[PDB]
């Protein structure tokens, strides 16, 4: 567990991507290597897999001597990170001691000591699955549709055809459909190998999208009764990925 120093410009933007991931997760193992920071976890019900990738190119300074793994209480991490201001510089530093030093540099120098915990790691690999539909979408539309569907039901069907993407949610007598075609502003791209249908639980979806920005481009991949994969990019180089089990 050798010392490292990592610096990110924009503490608030870092906080907000940690808050997205923390919504499903309570404890995470961060793998720190020469090439960047990666984190891979499952939510307690083992229905969602989260995969974060922060390559070293998004850090203004990145000094890692040898690769190591640190365990972190995501709630306590998140409460500290929330104190960051939008033009603060964030510094994550470890010494010989077994705690993370989190510093905000801006109008003043604020440093928190975060204690490192032991997180037993599951055998987790991001499998490359045969998705038959891919959709790129304005976060606003996606956040919209999940909220709308929650008025009606607990589950949300995704339907991809060659020229339209539909989310549909039916209650006992109420019903909502959101429909997108490439003529529409919210939809940036749509590729379908064959017409695809699946359904996912809104509670999980709501938690996945709660931190996503209204203007960010979100990529969905799914298949008939397959997991749903959702991803967006951080500073164009980082990636956050969710893999969500279908409702069967």
Pick 19 or 176: Cβ nearer a second copy: 176
Query: Minimum distance from CB of 167 to a second copy (Å)?
Result: 9
Pick 50 or 149: Cβ nearer a second copy: 149
The site for a second copy (CB under 8 A) is made up of 76, 79-80, 83, 106-115, 138, 140-141, 144-145, 147-148, 151-152, 173-180, 184-187
Cα distance between residue 199 and residue 222, in whole Å: 10
Cite the DSSP H helix spans in the chain: 11-22, 74-81, 139-150, 202-209
Query: Minimum distance from CB of 130 to a second copy (Å)?
Result: 28
Number of neighbouring beta carbons within 10 Å of residue 12:
16
Query: Minimum distance from CB of 48 to a second copy (Å)?
Result: 25
- Here the tokens at position 126 are 């991001």
Query: Minimum distance from CB of 153 to a second copy (Å)?
Result: 12
Query: Minimum distance from CB of 46 to a second copy (Å)?
Result: 30
Q: Is 15 helix (H, G, I), strand (E, B) or coil?
A: helix
Pick 109 or 210: Cβ nearer a second copy: 109
Pick 58 or 156: Cβ nearer a second copy: 156
**C-beta of residue 157 within 8 angstroms of C-beta of residue 167:** yes
Q: Is 10 left (phi over 0), alpha (psi -120 to 50) or beta?
A: left
Pick 39 or 114: Cβ nearer a second copy: 114
Cα distance between residue 11 and residue 81, in whole Å: 7
């Amino acid at each position: 567990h050798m010392p490292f120093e990592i610096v990110f410009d924009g503490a608030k933007e870092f906080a907000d991507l940690i808050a997205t991931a923390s919504n499903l997760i309570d404890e995470a193992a961060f793998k720190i290597t020469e090439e960047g920071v990666s984190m891979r976890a499952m939510d307690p019900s083992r229905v969602v897999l989260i995969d974060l990738n922060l390559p070293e190119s998004i850090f203004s300074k990145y000094e890692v001597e040898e690769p190591e793994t640190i365990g972190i209480n995501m709630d306590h991490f998140k409460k500290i990170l929330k104190r960051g201001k939008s033009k603060d510089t964030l510094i994550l530093r470890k010494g010989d001691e077994n705690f993370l030093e989190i510093t905000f540099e801006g109008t003043a120098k604020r440093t928190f000591r975060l204690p490192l915990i032991d997180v037993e790691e599951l055998e987790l690999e991001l499998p490359e699955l045969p998705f038959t539909a891919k959709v790129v979408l304005l976060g606003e539309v996606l956040k919209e549709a999940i909220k709308d569907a929650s008025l009606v039901s607990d589950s949300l069907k995704f339907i991809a055809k060659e020229d339209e993407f539909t989310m549909k949610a039916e209650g006992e007598t109420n019903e909502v459909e959101i429909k997108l075609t490439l003529e529409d502003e919210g939809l940036l791209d749509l590729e379908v190998e064959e017409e695809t249908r699946s359904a996912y639980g809104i509670s999980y979806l709501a938690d996945m999208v709660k931190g996503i920005g209204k203007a960010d481009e979100v990529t969905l991949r799914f298949g008939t009764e397959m997991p749903l994969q959702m991803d967006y990019f951080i500073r164009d180089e980082g990636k956050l990925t969710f893999l969500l089990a279908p409702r069967v």
